[PDB]
Amino acid sequence: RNLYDTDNIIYSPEGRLYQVEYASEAIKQGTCAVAIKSKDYVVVSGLKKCISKLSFPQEKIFKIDDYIGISMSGITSDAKVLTKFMQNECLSHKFLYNENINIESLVRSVADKYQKNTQKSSKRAFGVGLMIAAYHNEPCIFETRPNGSYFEYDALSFGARSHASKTYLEKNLHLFEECSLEELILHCLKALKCSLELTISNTALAVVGKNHPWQEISSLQLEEYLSKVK
């Protein structure tokens, strides 16, 4: 495969684009992130990367709009570019019209932005995967990928050691729909803990939902939840 992985516009004999696959491979080295939802809420949690003793944790989740947030896994500069693009699209929709942007349209625009960099030899795929949490008439979780695809999930997780989180979500998916917000936060934190302890510093945690704009959970409430999980 050394012949066909050299430029991003080359298909291998098996019909594979190896550079896009490598951009996807970049995503698994990021820290784990998890997202679940109930009938009313989406709860996103994430492990903040800490590179040394004297470091501060890398930010994991970002606010896009009043009822839209994201988490990232992969190259953080690509995530910053996509974050700025999404925020500008949301604010432009709120400027031209007097309403919130449609979440499906925003995710499709992001996926188009992903795909347009896979076509030309003078461009590379964004080496980052975004999970997008929002409440637009209902809780919704989307995922984007380097190849320009996107999907919608009842529960999502990815990053380093995300397989254990996926197994926990597979076991516990049927409970989340009828769970209350506190139980939903506990379930998301437990799914994140399966990937590993968690700490107020190293744990990003946010909620969005009905009558509830996107809000990072405060350090004291996060301390209470982490104490309850343990």
Partner: protein, 242 residues
């Protein structure tokens, strides 16, 4: 060495990159369109997502439409096909802006074929990896189904299948003439063919991995996805038959 660029012919007069695209498409999720007595029925079987259990129910839909009266689906990569479908919608918009009537189906098919073909000419552009079905039905003209291949070839069919297991689906569909069978009766046959052909598909994932749509008399000759009330007895009868 000759298979490292779409813009190079091999000594035996072949473009290997397009053949590798064909190999990519033949491994992807199945799509089919079938002309019937009263309409056309389109069905996309997303067998690849049998592993992913947490995907939202019926969120993934490869069936799209143009002008509310042309079905457009695909087999291949989602992003490339979204690019092609956006081009189709742009062509329809420009045609109506110029002429104040909707684009004829064959003109749209030709234009999208040229758009696909243009990316197979230059050394710096990735050719699109997707086969595109575009279809429509009218009371007077009956059904017109077209399949656009990744090389730019466009061909008209009474029924067509692309993607994984397309040989078995074609063999089962060819067993009887559907131009004297209604779409409602055809849904049961499509479910039976899916159960017999795709080994990953079974009774427990037919309801959430298969997209259905049609254009027939009941839909007033306009796009619609099959409601659960019409799908459920059909797949139940198919499972009981199988």
């Amino acid at each position: 060495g000759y298979d490292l660029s779409v813009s190079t012919f091999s000594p035996d007069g072949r473009l290997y990159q397009v053949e590798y695209i064909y190999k990519s498409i033949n491994n992807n999720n199945t799509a089919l369109c079938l002309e019937c007595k009263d309409g056309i029925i389109c069905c996309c079987i997303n067998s690849n997502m049998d592993k992913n259990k947490m995907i939202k129910k019926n969120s993934y839909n490869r069936i799209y439409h143009v002008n509310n009266n042309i079905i457009i689906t695909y087999s291949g990569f989602d992003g490339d096909a979204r690019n092609i479908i956006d081009r189709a919608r742009s062509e329809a918009n420009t045609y109506y802006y110029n002429f104040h009537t909707n684009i004829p189906l064959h003109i749209l098919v030709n234009r999208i074929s040229l758009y696909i073909h243009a990316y197979t000419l230059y050394w710096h552009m990735r050719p699109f990896a997707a086969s595109i079905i575009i279809s429509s039905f009218n009371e007077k003209d009956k059904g017109d189904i077209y399949c656009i291949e990744p090389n730019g070839a466009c061909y008209k069919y009474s029924g067509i299948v692309i993607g994984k297991n397309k040989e078995m689906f074609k063999t089962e569909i060819e067993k009887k003439d559907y131009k004297d069978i209604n779409v409602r009766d055809a849904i049961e046959d499509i479910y039976k063919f899916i159960l017999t052909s795709d080994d990953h598909m079974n009774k427990n994932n037919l309801q959430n991995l298969v997209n259905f749509s049609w254009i027939c008399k009941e839909s007033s000759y306009e796009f619609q996805n099959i409601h659960e009330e019409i799908l459920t007895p059909a797949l139940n009868k198919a499972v009981e038959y199988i």
